[PDB]
Design a protein around this ligand. Structure first.
Ligand SMILES: [Mg+2]
Ligand SMILES: [Mg+2]
Ligand SMILES: [Mg+2]
Ligand SMILES: [Mg+2]
Ligand SMILES: [Mg+2]
Ligand code: NA
Length: 270
RNA sequence: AUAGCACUCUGCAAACACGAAAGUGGACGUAUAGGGUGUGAUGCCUGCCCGGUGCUGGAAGGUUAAUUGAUGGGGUUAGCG
């Protein structure tokens, strides 16, 4: 979906149509307020730069735990969620309860989904990892028992269940890393719906300003008091590239955790 | 400064930043996501060099601190004079 260059701004704009969406107001009981922090903590200092000035957004409560076991539900509609890059689906259970989930690929209104041990192997069903079939592709993987999905939630993300022993299951993450997961944890069958997210193009600075991103200033343009890459009578790049606080930026590993080293089987060749 | 491009780090109690700690932002986000660095629409593209510094992976052949103290010598009483 390219835009005709009627203006210098409209020349390099690419968007996704996805006309199958709801195109309406979201479910009111499942919507709560949400405000912009501006990248500042309770002390008032800027802890994360390049954040501020976006569009007003409400928060849609997505049910990540899916603890309603053995109750079949039907898909009502697919909606647009500004809080994430994926699409959401509205489910209606037998008793009449309404909940929001992460819509897998191809899920449309009228589909039947269950979250239990005896659930069949269909896209959108949540099952423990031991009941999962070997070699399949999963999403919304759970790490701690009972907390809810924490992995493969972005648009188009998916993991593969390589193998499972008696006590653990081996999965390969999207980054290329193989790690161990408890066999009691749960996952969902299929891949996340929104797949054409990376194919979009903003086209102008206005879109980045709409999405709540502030301009980035290179360290070279700053003064010696501001950035280590400061000073010089012209365009100069004096020292090894570092962060504004003195940390190396090229090929320097920053992982320091020692508590969960046993889980990672093979690294992503970092 | 900018949309675009590339490199690199981060598997989530994430990397990173604030504080003396608790705690907070990142994010009520989950690698099509977040941070750092360089270049700057688009067309055609982007040659050689790992000697130096840096980073990454190893051997552990040489040395190496903290920790221990078999000895060796000295001082002073006591035994043989
Ligand atoms: Mg930034
Ligand atoms: Mg940029
Ligand atoms: Mg300085
Ligand atoms: Mg300089
Ligand atoms: Mg150019
Ligand atoms: Na070198």
């Amino acid at each position: 979906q390219k835009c005709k260059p009627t203006s210098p701004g409209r020349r390099f704009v690419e968007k996704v149509v996805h006309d199958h969406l709801h195109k309406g107001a979201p479910y009111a009981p499942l919507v709560e307020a949400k405000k912009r922090t501006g990248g500042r903590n309770n002390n008032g200092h800027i802890t994360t730069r390049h954040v501020g000035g976006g569009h007003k957004q409400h928060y849609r409560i997505v049910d990540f735990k899916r603890n309603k076991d053995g109750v079949p539900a039907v898909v009502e509609r697919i909606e647009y969620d500004p809080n994430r890059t994926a699409h959401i689906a509205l489910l209606k259970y037998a008793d009449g309860e309404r909940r929001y989930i992460i819509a897998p690929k191809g899920l449309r209104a009228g589909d039947k989904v269950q979250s239990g041990n005896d659930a069949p192997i269909r896209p959108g069903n949540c099952l423990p990892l031991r009941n999962m079939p070997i070699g399949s592709t999963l999403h919304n993987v759970e790490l701690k028992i009972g907390k809810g999905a924490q992995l493969a939630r972005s648009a188009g993300a998916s993991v593969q269940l390589l193998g499972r022993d008696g006590s653990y299951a081996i999965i390969r993450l999207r980054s290329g890393e193989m790690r161990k997961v408890h066999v009691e944890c749960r996952a969902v069958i299929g891949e996340v719906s929104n797949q054409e997210n990376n194919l979009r193009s903003l086209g102008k600075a206005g879109a980045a300003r709409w999405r709540g991103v502030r301009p980035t200033v290179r360290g070279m343009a700053m003064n010696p008091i501001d950035h280590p890459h400061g000073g010089g009578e012209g365009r100069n790049k004096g020292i090894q590239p570092v962060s504004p606080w003195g940390q190396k930026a090229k090929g320097y590993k920053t992982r320091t955790n020692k508590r969960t080293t046993k889980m990672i089987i093979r690294d992503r060749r970092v």
